[PDB]
């Protein structure tokens, strides 16, 4: 009949607006049959058939109107029932029984009922949380059937959010605050960000509430660490608050997060909280991809060496590079660059950690045609820096400058390994902002080469540094020789009294020691309802020179190129340091195939060495 809709034609005369004909029987059955009290009964007997019949008669009663206030009054009855003497209330029990029908009914009429519940929720909270969980789970199962439901629920909640002040007031029980946090997190995860993140209604107000709880000292490290997961829906459409977010999360980090994690071994509760919080922040940030939080993340990463499981963040970098729109990721690139070329007095090692731990695996998996715009923007500044700041030497600040130069050289290597010479070329280069932006590519070869080659000064305050500097110059040379000057007759460093290779390799080191589905969707749905190599590391150039060997092989009988002719002259004179000889011998080992027809020529150099000498110890080693 209700589907026919002629109920009122057969409805008996309702003396009041209340549907007493159905409401009276509703109360007189539900509040009495299940009641153990008032008859000295032990939970009077109910049957499963009676349960489904009860569901049917409840949806019947919902076919009647003018009963929502009666339902609110009945559920808001903290009348305790005693079973066998344990105690529990009555209205909450009935709601726990028939939350399915109750959620259908509250879906039918929401705004008035929501307002009545939440204005009367100043004292009681638990069934409010339960009914909103029912709302979200039902509409999220039914999200393939209706979509506007949760949207209008969110609008109604934001319309009156101020009455939630019993929650999240910084004297309320911690359970109350984390319960309201859970419910708001759930309603926001079902909601679209645009429906909330835009400046409207209670979004400034609930945002201030979110800041206050995130700034609440009553909440500990773990509570706010769980709270921060909703960042992707706050990272956008925020202005002025961005610096407020910066300050609040910065004070949280400085007052809650130690610089070193290994100081607390696994099993330390604070260490486990540390790792859980970093995981939560990482996943939420990866979902957001907001430049500001990326700066926060790149500054918390790079403050030590091998201290925060950097490989996870490398995986995050490659995932982000594989994703994200071009303009967005470009903006992230300038954002991460702005303090990296900034003159913040970072420690030289710390600053090179900043560049290394992010940029290499960021760009190595990033899509091109977006990197190019960033390169065009930064080329003038980068070349201006690379043509200046050489004069002073007498403090570690110039060590920081030359470390930034190291970064420049190695990043030039890494991205020019990726691009052809069409927008950057001689006599035609659409991207050459140095000359015209339409021709010039030749000066950089000299600029990097004369940095790579240096007559060894008797003094060096940055032995390992200057060494890796000339290494990075040689690496950018490797890139520019992989993509430019691919013709035969390549260049090798030493000509006369300059000795370039000695500024690439460390000495006095003991090196080389002795040898979908509906059921899966429903499961995820209920889950949201509950809201839950050695000798290859000793240097770096072995891979680039193997690439160079295969590159010249692609460019390719007793044939002897001049550079490998000197390498025959090399490795055959024991007077030259044996460290240089063993490094070059390892490089030859990595690329024997090209020397296979010429190993007969190579017989004399390899033969001359290690006849009776050491190879990082005595005899047997990892390289035999």
């Amino acid at each position: 009949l209700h589907r026919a809709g002629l109920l009122h034609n057969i409805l008996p005369s309702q003396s009041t607006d209340l549907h007493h004909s159905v409401g009276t029987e509703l109360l007189s059955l539900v509040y009495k049959g299940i009641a153990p009290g008032d008859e000295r009964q032990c939970l009077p007997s109910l049957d499963l058939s009676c349960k489904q019949l009860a569901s049917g008669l409840l949806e019947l009663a919902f076919a009647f109107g003018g009963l929502c206030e009666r339902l609110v009054s009945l559920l808001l009855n903290p009348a305790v029932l005693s079973t066998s003497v344990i105690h529990f209330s009555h209205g909450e029990y009935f709601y726990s029984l028939f939350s399915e029908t109750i959620n259908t009914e509250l879906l039918k009429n929401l705004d008035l009922a929501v307002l009545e519940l939440m204005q009367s929720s100043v004292d009681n909270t638990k069934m409010v949380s339960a009914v909103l969980n029912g709302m979200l789970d039902q509409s999220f199962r039914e999200r393939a059937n209706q979509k506007h439901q949760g949207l209008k629920l969110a609008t109604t909640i934001l319309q009156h959010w101020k009455k939630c002040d019993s929650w999240w007031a910084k004297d309320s029980p911690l359970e109350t605050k984390m319960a309201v946090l859970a419910l708001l997190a759930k309603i926001l995860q079902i909601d679209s960000s645009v429906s909330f993140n835009t400046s409207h209604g209670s979004f400034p107000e609930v945002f201030t509430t979110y800041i206050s709880l995130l700034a609440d000292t009553k909440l500990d490290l773990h509570l706010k660490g769980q709270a921060v997961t909703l960042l992707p829906f706050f990272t956008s459409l925020t202005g002025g608050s961005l610096e407020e977010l910066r300050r609040v999360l910065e004070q949280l980090i400085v007052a809650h997060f130690p610089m070193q994690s290994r100081e607390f071994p696994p099993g330390t509760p604070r260490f486990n909280n540390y790792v859980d919080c970093m995981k939560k922040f990482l996943d939420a940030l990866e979902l957001s991809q907001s430049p500001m939080l990326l700066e926060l993340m790149t500054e918390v990463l790079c403050r030590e060496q091998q201290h925060v499981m950097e490989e996870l963040f490398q995986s995050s970098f490659r995932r982000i590079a594989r994703r994200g729109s071009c303009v967005t990721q470009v903006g992230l690139l300038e954002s991460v660059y702005e303090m990296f070329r900034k003159d913040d007095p970072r420690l030289s090692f710390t600053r090179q950690s900043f560049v290394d731990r992010s940029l290499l695996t960021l760009l190595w998996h990033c899509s091109l045609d977006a990197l190019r715009e960033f390169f065009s923007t930064i080329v003038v500044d980068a070349i201006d820096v690379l043509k200046s700041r050489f004069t002073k030497l007498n403090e570690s600040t110039f060590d920081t400058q030359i470390t930034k130069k190291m970064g420049y050289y190695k990043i030039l290597d890494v991205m020019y390994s990726r691009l052809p010479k069409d927008d950057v070329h001689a006599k035609e280069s659409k991207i050459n902002q140095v000359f015209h932006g339409s021709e010039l590519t030749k000066t950089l070869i000299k600029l990097c080469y004369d940095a790579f080659t240096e007559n060894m000064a008797g003094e060096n305050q940055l032995l390992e540094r200057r060494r890796l500097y000339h290494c990075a110059a040689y690496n950018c040379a490797i890139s520019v020789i992989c993509c430019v000057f691919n013709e035969l007759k390549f260049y090798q460093g030493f000509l006369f009294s300059e000795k370039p290779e000695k500024n690439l390799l460390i000495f006095e080191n003991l090196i080389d020691l002795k040898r979908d589905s509906t059921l899966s969707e429903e499961m995820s749905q209920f889950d949201f309802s509950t809201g839950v190599m050695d000798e290859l590391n000793r240097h770096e150039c072995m891979a680039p020179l193997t690439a160079l060997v295969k590159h010249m092989h692609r460019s390719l009988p007793r044939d002897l190129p001049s550079w490998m002719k000197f390498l025959h002259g090399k490795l055959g004179n024991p007077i030259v340091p044996l460290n240089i000889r063993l490094f070059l011998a390892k490089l030859v080992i990595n690329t024997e195939e090209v020397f296979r027809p010429y190993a007969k020529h190579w017989l004399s150099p390899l033969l001359q060495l290690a006849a009776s000498e050491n190879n990082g110890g005595e005899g047997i080693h990892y390289m035999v």
Binding site: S84, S517, T518, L519, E522, M523
Partner: protein
């Protein structure tokens, strides 16, 4: 439970399986040696509500959970150039993940469910069925219904729910509903195949005597086929003998003996062949149960004799010996006739073990039919054609894809030969008549009917480019006589010919539509 339904299947840290839990739930169903210790070491059960054995509540909670879960989950199939005959074919799951998980859960529960005594299941014996019957009425093609209801009725007979049913009103309604469902699914038995046929056999053979007493003759052919399949799969025969004992002890020998004539014989091959469940204890079971009966009562296993010429098959396929062959040697070439080997080699090519007797038999039959084709250039094998090519079409649709791969190119080549002008008269007529009157008429072999449809459809080709239409008129065989034969078979009251003709045209669609 919807977690556990995502386990891997099995065929008839390392990734788990369903079995890794089944004993646990039995340990949960039998949590009587473990909650006893907890309640013994505890003293809380003074102001506590309950101190009973909660295994009953465990079973109830499991049953309500699985009920709402199976109501939540849904199963359905989809279809897909070439039409298919049987509704069981051209079926592809709309969401096969649901099918796989449903499998996982059914072979998970199949062992846990029956072990516990079903007084816990008693309050469900009606309710649990009803919506499940709904689930069967909308989707009558699921093995889980049949086998889970087999173990269900086993549990019910452990509780004796069907005892004293009205000729209680609730008992009367449930019993009548299962009676009508059982009779209709017994009627529909004929259209199911393995892994679905076997399940409904286990169903319609696990029912209690309160239902067999109402009707026996409908289940008589069902019992025959179930016991002839029990030779191939012993558990069928085992549960069959159990059911036989149940009703035979429970029902008087006053309405079954008019059927004992055709009830008994299907067991002979059990004891004729050899000297968990094996054929040997199968036999020993039938042994004592047969001896429990009287002499004249168990005389009716010899009643299958009207087909004595069919088991004989010793009527000469070729009356004269037309398969002369002199084996090549040095000083002696015995001339050998090959007509006698035909029956035995037929049952080799059809029924042989080691899976390699069959292929060698196929090789020899290729060679010998090839030799007789060579010989035919000198006798009338009219009777040989009639009696021999039906088993060739029988082996056409063999489940062995190797066999079909061997045979169908030969089929199309012999089609080319037969519809040639030199073979279009008086010698293809025997082949065409035997090929059309068998293989499409059969109540079984839907695959064979389809293969006949495709081969005749491709036979349309070279029936027009090897025979000029004027020669089709001159030759008595033509499209017109084929039309009369098709009409005569279509009008036949047996629905097998009706479905055959309809499916034949359905096949020739996209070929006869080009005819102008």
């Amino acid at each position: 439970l919807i977690r556990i339904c995502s386990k891997p299947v099995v065929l008839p840290w390392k990734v788990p399986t369903y079995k890794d839990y089944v004993d646990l739930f039995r340990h949960l169903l039998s949590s009587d040696q473990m909650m006893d210790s907890i309640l013994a070491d505890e003293a809380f059960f003074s102001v506590n509500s309950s101190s009973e054995s909660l295994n009953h509540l465990l079973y109830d909670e499991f049953v309500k959970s699985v009920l709402k879960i199976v109501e939540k989950l849904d199963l359905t199939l989809e279809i897909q150039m070439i039409p298919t005959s049987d509704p069981a074919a051209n079926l592809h799951p709309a969401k096969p993940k649901d099918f796989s998980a449903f499998i996982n859960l059914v072979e998970f529960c199949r062992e846990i469910l029956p072990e516990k005594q079903a007084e816990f299941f008693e309050p469900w014996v009606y309710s649990f069925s009803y919506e499940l019957i709904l689930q069967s009425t909308r989707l009558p093609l699921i093995s889980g219904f049949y086998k889970l209801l087999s173990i269900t009725v086993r549990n019910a007979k452990k509780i004796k729910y069907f005892e004293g049913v009205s000729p209680d009103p609730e008992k009367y309604s449930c019993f009548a509903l299962f009676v009508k469902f059982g009779k209709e699914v017994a009627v529909k038995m004929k259209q199911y195949k393995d892994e679905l046929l076997a399940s409904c056999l286990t169903f319609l053979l696990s029912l209690p005597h309160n239902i067999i007493e109402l009707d026996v003759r409908a289940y008589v052919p069902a019992l025959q086929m179930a016991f002839k399949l029990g030779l191939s799969y012993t558990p069928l025969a085992e549960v069959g003998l159990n059911a036989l004992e149940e009703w035979s002890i429970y029902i008087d020998r006053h309405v079954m003996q008019p059927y004992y004539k055709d009830i008994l014989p299907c067991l002979d091959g059990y004891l004729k062949t050899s000297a968990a469940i094996s054929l040997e204890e199968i036999r020993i079971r039938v042994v004592q149960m047969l001896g429990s009966l009287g002499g004249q009562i168990n005389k009716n296993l010899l009643t299958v004799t009207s087909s004595d010429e069919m088991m004989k098959s010793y009527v000469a396929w070729d009356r004269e010996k037309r398969l002369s062959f002199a084996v090549p040697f040095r000083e002696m070439k015995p001339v050998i006739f090959l007509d006698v080997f035909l029956p035995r080699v037929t049952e080799l090519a059809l029924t042989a073990s080691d899976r390699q007797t069959k292929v060698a038999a196929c090789e020899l039959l290729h060679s010998m039919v090839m030799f007789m084709l060579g010989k035919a250039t000198q006798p009338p094998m009219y009777q040989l054609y009639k009696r021999t090519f039906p088993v060739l079409l029988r082996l056409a649709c063999d489940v062995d894809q190797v066999t079909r791969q061997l045979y169908e190119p030969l089929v199309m080549q012999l089609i080319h030969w037969f519809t040639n002008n030199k073979k279009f008269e008086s010698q293809d007529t025997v082949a065409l008549l035997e090929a059309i009157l068998d293989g499409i008429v059969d109540p079984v072999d839907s695959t064979l009917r389809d293969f006949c449809g495709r081969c005749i459809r491709e036979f349309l080709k070279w029936s027009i480019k090897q025979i000029t239409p004027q020669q089709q008129e001159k030759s008595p065989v033509n499209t017109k006589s084929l039309f009369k034969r098709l009409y005569s078979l279509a009008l036949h009251p047996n629905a097998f010919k009706r479905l055959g003709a309809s499916l034949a045209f359905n096949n020739i669609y996209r070929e006869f539509r080009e005819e102008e």
